[PDB]
Amino acid sequence: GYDRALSIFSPDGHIFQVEYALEAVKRGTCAVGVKGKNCVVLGCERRSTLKLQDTRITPSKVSKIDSHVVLSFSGLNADSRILIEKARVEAQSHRLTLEDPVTVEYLTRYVAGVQQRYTQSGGVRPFGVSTLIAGFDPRDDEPKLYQTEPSGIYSSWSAQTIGRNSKTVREFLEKNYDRKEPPATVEECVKLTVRSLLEVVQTGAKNIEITVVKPDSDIVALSSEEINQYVTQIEQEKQE
Amino acid sequence: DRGVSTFSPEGRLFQVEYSLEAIKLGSTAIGIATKEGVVLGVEKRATSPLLESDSIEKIVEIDRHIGCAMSGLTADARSMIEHARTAAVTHNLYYDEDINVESLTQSVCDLALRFGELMSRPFGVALLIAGHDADDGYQLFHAEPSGTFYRYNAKAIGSGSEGAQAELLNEWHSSLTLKEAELLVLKILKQVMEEKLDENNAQLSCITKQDGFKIYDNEKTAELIKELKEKEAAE
Amino acid sequence: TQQPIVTGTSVISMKYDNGVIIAADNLGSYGSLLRFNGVERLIPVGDNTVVGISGDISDMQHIERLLKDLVTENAYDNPLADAEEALEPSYIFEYLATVMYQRRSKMNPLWNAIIVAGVQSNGDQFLRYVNLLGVTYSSPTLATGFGAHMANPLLRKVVDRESDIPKTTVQVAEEAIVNAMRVLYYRDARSSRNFSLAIIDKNTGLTFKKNLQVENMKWDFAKDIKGYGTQKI
Amino acid sequence: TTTLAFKFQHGVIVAVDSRATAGSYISSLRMNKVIEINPYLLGTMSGCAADCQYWERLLAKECRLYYLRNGERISVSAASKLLSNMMLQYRGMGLSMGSMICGWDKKGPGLYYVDDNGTRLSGQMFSTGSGNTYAYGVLDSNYKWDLSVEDALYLGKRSILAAAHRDAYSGGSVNLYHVTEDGWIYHGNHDVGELFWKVKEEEGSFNNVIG
Amino acid sequence: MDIILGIRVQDSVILASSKAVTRGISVLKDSDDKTRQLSPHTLMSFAGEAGDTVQFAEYIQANIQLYSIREDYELSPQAVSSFVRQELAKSIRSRRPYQVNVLIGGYDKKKNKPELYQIDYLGTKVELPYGAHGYSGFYTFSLLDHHYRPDMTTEEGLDLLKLCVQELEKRMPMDFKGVIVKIVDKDGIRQVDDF
Amino acid sequence: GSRRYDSRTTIFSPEGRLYQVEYALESISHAGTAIGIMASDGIVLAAERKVTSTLLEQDTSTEKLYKLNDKIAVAVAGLTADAEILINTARIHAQNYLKTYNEDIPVEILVRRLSDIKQGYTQHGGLRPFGVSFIYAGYDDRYGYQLYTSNPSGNYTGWKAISVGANTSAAQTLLQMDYKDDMKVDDAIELALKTLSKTTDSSALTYDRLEFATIRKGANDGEVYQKIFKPQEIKDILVKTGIT
Amino acid sequence: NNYDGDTVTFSPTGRLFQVEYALEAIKQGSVTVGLRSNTHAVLVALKRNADELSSYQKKIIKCDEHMGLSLAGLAPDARVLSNYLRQQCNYSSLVFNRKLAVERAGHLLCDKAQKNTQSYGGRPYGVGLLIIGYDKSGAHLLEFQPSGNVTELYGTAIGARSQGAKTYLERTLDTFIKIDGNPDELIKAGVEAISQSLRDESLTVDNLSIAIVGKDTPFTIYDGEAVAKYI
Amino acid sequence: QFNPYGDNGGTILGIAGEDFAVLAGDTRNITDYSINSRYEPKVFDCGDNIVMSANGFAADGDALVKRFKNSVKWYHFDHNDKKLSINSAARNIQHLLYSRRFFPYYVYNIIAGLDEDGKGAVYSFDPVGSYQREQCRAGGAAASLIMPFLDNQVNFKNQYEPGTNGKVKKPLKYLSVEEVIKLVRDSFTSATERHIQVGDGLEILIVTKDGVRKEFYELKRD
Ligand SMILES: *[C@@](C)(CO)[C@](*)(O)[C@H](Cc1ccccc1)NC(=O)[C@H](Cc1ccc(OC)cc1)NC(=O)[C@H](C)NC(=O)CN1CCOCC1
Ligand SMILES: [Mg+2]
């Protein structure tokens, strides 16, 4: 078998293949995660260089791993399918051997472990993907939002963004998101998520996708018109 | 290119030496061993204020009598910890007893040089393994990716290590109490950290014979920080 | 799992004051057929050990080759092969015992019963048994098959316990072994008159005697025996 | 063997005998048929002693690893399932094990029956071993959810006594346990010889026996 | 385990499964649910060798739930039954076959039709208006042959099912401790708590 | 040892791109243009054969359009040999699905499977990727008529109208201009041929330089028919639309 | 230069640079001394610490009741090789009821190290070993190099500044070989030998490590206050 | 058909004192009606103040002892010459036996020594690895003959105090090493009389804090 060590240390103590995988994430479309008091919202950029697209059948950016957990990403699209598939298999495997669904923290830890394994295994390259994993643990009303990256490190975030121009939207979130008082309702949480994407997106038309996840496996994706109403209200307040 | 298990003209493994450079970039971790227990403390170093700092888990339980702190590429440490925990519990299954701290450390270090063309590269993380057993008492070990481990009375690893190690050189003596050690770790962490030390960006832990391995609450650490500030202002 | 085809019967042995004696007949039976009359079942290893084998002859020939190969292998990179690092009876036995037990554990045994007789470096007598099951034991007298039932009782009259060994001379021990071989020829239906005998002494070394015969046999009383009860003529 | 275990208002009772046989020969008068897996988890043993000890002690390893990985105690449901999955690997190979996994977790008190076939059953009351039929008789007629800790301990103790008397392959002594939300509590070793005579006099039962 | 019945009526599928579990000469449980929900509109009941039944059922359940998540779509009862049959037909020539018989009751939301599939441990699949495994059919099929109509209501299906259980309780030597009944229709799966 | 000669086909550039995927895409850009257009009542597949000869046997030839099953077809752009390896795998997957579930495979599931195979060659194994881009035209009862594309990266996307191969930039602009949602198959046929006629590097677009196919519910009642156009039938539709 | 990228490449002068670089790792290692008489064999090792808070890295490893070694270079490689020796010593005992000859132990180490020098992908061992033992032919001392070369000697030393101790033993050859039936005097000669390799630092209680094996003496290691007698 | 198992007879006995422990066994080795050896040692000093005897099929018994002795050696290597406690040895042996759950070591095993508090300890094993700490245990051919005698004369079972008539038990007073050895010798002398596989000799290994001591006694040779 092909055993060649592709991810190796350089004289300055860097693993370039892992760092170049982060550059693939930088190229990917922007993804954002914001957790409110009783919900989590996942926002995703859709680049409008591709029109004549069939939005019914085109792979959506946010993927359900189980009925109570979702996963969005930034980076190589093909790579993300492999992580999602593995995550979905592990979710059913956990339910089967332990009789409880996975915690969001556990699912994150697994996906991050898969990414890490691909940084010190022979013959393979790292995943060019960073993920945002969100949801609610079984019989728990506390929101969960985690981030992973090609190196395999993971952590919990009150709010986070990844992908292209993520530096700008993180700047926005850092000054706009208050920890002492997070978005109390779904509306406030979605509004803050759309606002953050409008710093980067371009047009607020079909370029913004929003997915709201509430406790007890209550997950819904907003439509174009519903999002467009947020886009309208934000700019009308801005004209002042 | 060149082999992964290649020797340099000086007689060192290139990859092992390069992994040591990655560990120098890691966040600071300090360990101090006393006759009343071993203290382990780390710099959390959150990359952003929105990152929930309590999810940063750089101090970890291996067994009830063994704890572990890490510095460097912390993702690499997960499989090491998993092996450590398995080794510790498996020995308890085979021998109906706690495993020696040295034997546990040796088992972890046996993974280190299992790389080639087994895993494709050495680990990019160093570990401070602290614990207690009946034979050799309170112990602190430093486990490197070279497969070597040294026992230490006190040790610092990470970006502020040589500055911290010089400080530990002067401060450590064989009659330190647990409380004195706690304040000493906090003092040296505060010295080498970029940001101002508080209960949210730094974490303490200890291992004692009675209570075993315990990670300190943020409320408990906050009091020890306030106790430190007052005793430094006392002269 | 197999069945033994061509077989060798009893191997008998005993300790005496300065060494050990071992003997076995020269027959290779094929069931009730006395097929092969020139089979050597005592196999010397160096000048300090003799291995006596009973049971399946094809498996015996296999063991004979392992031992021959063992000597070759021991001499490799060994300047003291004919001195301090020569093969000892205890080494040769433990090797065979390891092989026998491994083979039974794979359910494919060497269908044999083996007695290793020899003298160690320090002059101590060595005598130990091992069989197809990997079962091992030591005694002042040892015998396989029929020998265990008929020979041991006769040999144990000479050396009944450990303290009787220094009191037993080589002449007495050989006499007892030779008598036992005669008794086995009288009573074992798969035995032969011709046999081999080996003496391993700590002073006089290895003496290997071939083409021995059972002699001084009593048959004359047969002429008087008539019928099975009431018959007079 | 006779073993039993049942849930009630104040947790779960666990009572076992201590006899071990090798045919008609009583090989052991006092064998521990309960395993302490963790302060909140117990396991009973019936069938092949070696199989029971090995696999349940291996379950404890796996339950312990669960705590280290997740920083939290394993559920009774998950522990029982891990054990059942082990039995399922050695499917048809000839293992003989019948055990009840008793404990307290976030759902409250938990009790699962698990055997060599891989069967895994949740329930209020179980009894395993050669003398289970005798134990069930006493349990079914006297069991309530509203039992006091004192009366519940006696029921399990009395139920084992019933089996030890009639079943030739049950006896020796009675080991009692009581599982609470603060963990399990050992309630001693009780010799059946002494216990029988005591119960006979105090209760008035076993009238047909002379003493 | 012992008795599992199934009946497909006008607008639903009804599955009835015994509650008893026996080890040796003792009945360990009299409230056992011999069924698994594979999807919101698909239910599978099972009977066979101890242990194998639940493992197989749970293994199927996991596979169908995995499919549902991957495609964000519910497989038709027909598609699920074919998947199950293949797994059993694969199993029968294995080193150690899974000795499990199943009934699959599902409501096809596309066709707006209830569907009942009977599959034995060999992988023998048949779509039926009513079905059973083991000896259950010997006692019950004569009643079903007589009383069954395809335009029956769910309530009429339950009454006919009661008659089948009563006949089983009269003429079977074994005490199966009654049955748990579940209904599968357009609105999903629900359990009849009084039977 | 052998390391010396390893090109390392599965690595990132400093910019975070996969070298071999990018170079494979460069190869595909020289391949004959293939176009797919989805209408309300069917799908059109049109593709240009590369500089042919008069002595090529066209009626028995197939380099662009392939049948995966009765409901799904593909247009190829890139190395034909590479494409046939993948096509045969896709045909097998469709039959495996049919055997397992007793239902025809949904279009996206087949597309995802092939795209996942392509992805594997970019992440592990040390082999070169497949130098192929597909346009998938198919029908199932969930989403109806569907167009997809996949490329050597293993990434796939859904489309109303799309082109692969040469001059896709020009071709996509022309399709984006004239395409409308209420369009029908006969109109889509005309759009596809007109787009090829303007983007082609050849002097003129003729029947012998084209492969053409439609997927229509224009089959007697609720069912779907695949039509791989014969040389004479391509010649007729060229006259009908007014190109020759 | 161009021929030191891997172990599978000879240089134009017939040299194996990767092996030579592995040999260099031994020279960086701390000094250790080996010597023997006709009755006993002794190892003396200068242990090295990381700093004042750290412990002193152990240098001596036991392989059997009658055999053991001291290391200089990569300590993990010594663990791998000593583990192999333990197994081979043990295979000899279990199968042949025979204590493994020291000379044969050297031959086994040689052959194990050699395979790493001729194959692609692997690397040579980065450690030197001094094996002492007492077998049926008396006391023995071996020197192991990771090139594969194993040498039987009366006395030797390896590590940094080992040339000083080696010269001393070369002078003392006729004296220490005759030290029969006196373990303490043989150790003294070893401690005096290793002292010729010291600079700046001297032999302290947690610095010094000594091992001995002999006629009626199992392989035993002395550390801590057990070696204060010899300081 | 090949039968990989055999029966070499023999009988063993382990008794735990207050600060000592004994492990005794006869020295007779047999097959069917033949005597193989009148003196074939069966109880072994395994190091770390532990003694062990594997009774039943001698080939499996020798193999197990050999492997445990080896396990002790590697326990020293791997854990800095730490002493293997009797409870740790017992658990280790369980795993040695269960390695062959499906092709067992056909032996009943007993080990003896001192626990970590200095008190006497005996552990008992079945062929597949079930074990338990005990005060008194006989194993092998004549186990059924000896155990009832020990229940009576060591644990004072069915013995009550005169005058009370069954109301007050005989108090469980501790036994000395000299008293235990008397019960051991009488156990084997009685077993020799009524069991054909028991005889020839008796070898006892006594374990104290001072070490492991041996005692040998002749038995009837018929
Ligand atoms: C009662 C006493 C039924 O006899 C219990 O089920 C009891 C349960 C138990 C649990 C843990 C610890 C001790 C006792 N079971 C036994 O005592 C058990 C009975 C039994 C034997 C064999 C079986 O099939 C494999 C099933 C049940 N007895 C034993 O396990 C005895 C102590 N040991 C053996 O039988 C060992 N075998 C192994 C092969 O060699 C022959 C002896
Ligand atoms: Mg007798």
mmCIF file of N, CA, C and O in Angstrom, chain F residues 48 197 200-206 208-209 243-244:
data_model
loop_
_atom_site.group_PDB
_atom_site.id
_atom_site.type_symbol
_atom_site.label_atom_id
_atom_site.label_comp_id
_atom_site.label_asym_id
_atom_site.label_seq_id
_atom_site.Cartn_x
_atom_site.Cartn_y
_atom_site.Cartn_z
ATOM 1 N N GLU F 48 -19.922 17.761 -28.467
ATOM 2 C CA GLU F 48 -19.139 17.872 -29.694
ATOM 3 C C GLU F 48 -17.993 16.859 -29.707
ATOM 4 O O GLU F 48 -17.147 16.863 -28.815
ATOM 5 N N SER F 197 -22.904 25.807 -31.668
ATOM 6 C CA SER F 197 -22.624 26.425 -32.966
ATOM 7 C C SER F 197 -21.815 27.723 -32.853
ATOM 8 O O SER F 197 -21.061 28.067 -33.765
ATOM 9 N N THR F 200 -18.087 26.575 -30.754
ATOM 10 C CA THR F 200 -17.219 25.596 -31.418
ATOM 11 C C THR F 200 -15.957 26.230 -32.007
ATOM 12 O O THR F 200 -15.994 27.356 -32.502
ATOM 13 N N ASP F 201 -14.847 25.499 -31.935
ATOM 14 C CA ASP F 201 -13.589 25.918 -32.561
ATOM 15 C C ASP F 201 -13.541 25.523 -34.039
ATOM 16 O O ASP F 201 -12.682 26.001 -34.783
ATOM 17 N N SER F 202 -14.457 24.649 -34.456
ATOM 18 C CA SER F 202 -14.567 24.237 -35.856
ATOM 19 C C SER F 202 -15.171 25.342 -36.717
ATOM 20 O O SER F 202 -15.801 26.271 -36.204
ATOM 21 N N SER F 203 -14.979 25.227 -38.028
ATOM 22 C CA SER F 203 -15.492 26.214 -38.983
ATOM 23 C C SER F 203 -17.020 26.191 -39.056
ATOM 24 O O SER F 203 -17.657 27.242 -39.150
ATOM 25 N N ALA F 204 -17.595 24.991 -39.017
ATOM 26 C CA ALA F 204 -19.048 24.817 -39.043
ATOM 27 C C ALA F 204 -19.464 23.574 -38.263
ATOM 28 O O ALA F 204 -18.718 22.596 -38.193
ATOM 29 N N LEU F 205 -20.660 23.623 -37.686
ATOM 30 C CA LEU F 205 -21.188 22.518 -36.889
ATOM 31 C C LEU F 205 -22.017 21.588 -37.773
ATOM 32 O O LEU F 205 -23.041 21.998 -38.322
ATOM 33 N N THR F 206 -21.561 20.343 -37.913
ATOM 34 C CA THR F 206 -22.223 19.344 -38.758
ATOM 35 C C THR F 206 -22.630 18.110 -37.950
ATOM 36 O O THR F 206 -22.219 17.949 -36.800
ATOM 37 N N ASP F 208 -21.864 14.941 -38.263
ATOM 38 C CA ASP F 208 -20.785 13.984 -37.994
ATOM 39 C C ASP F 208 -19.865 14.393 -36.838
ATOM 40 O O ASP F 208 -19.043 13.593 -36.388
ATOM 41 N N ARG F 209 -20.005 15.631 -36.367
ATOM 42 C CA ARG F 209 -19.185 16.152 -35.276
ATOM 43 C C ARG F 209 -19.987 16.306 -33.980
ATOM 44 O O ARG F 209 -19.565 17.020 -33.071
ATOM 45 N N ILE F 243 -29.552 25.375 -38.607
ATOM 46 C CA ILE F 243 -28.103 25.561 -38.471
ATOM 47 C C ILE F 243 -27.368 25.140 -39.752
ATOM 48 O O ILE F 243 -26.331 25.716 -40.089
ATOM 49 N N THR F 244 -27.906 24.146 -40.459
ATOM 50 C CA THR F 244 -27.359 23.714 -41.749
ATOM 51 C C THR F 244 -28.404 23.836 -42.854
ATOM 52 O O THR F 244 -29.563 23.467 -42.670
#
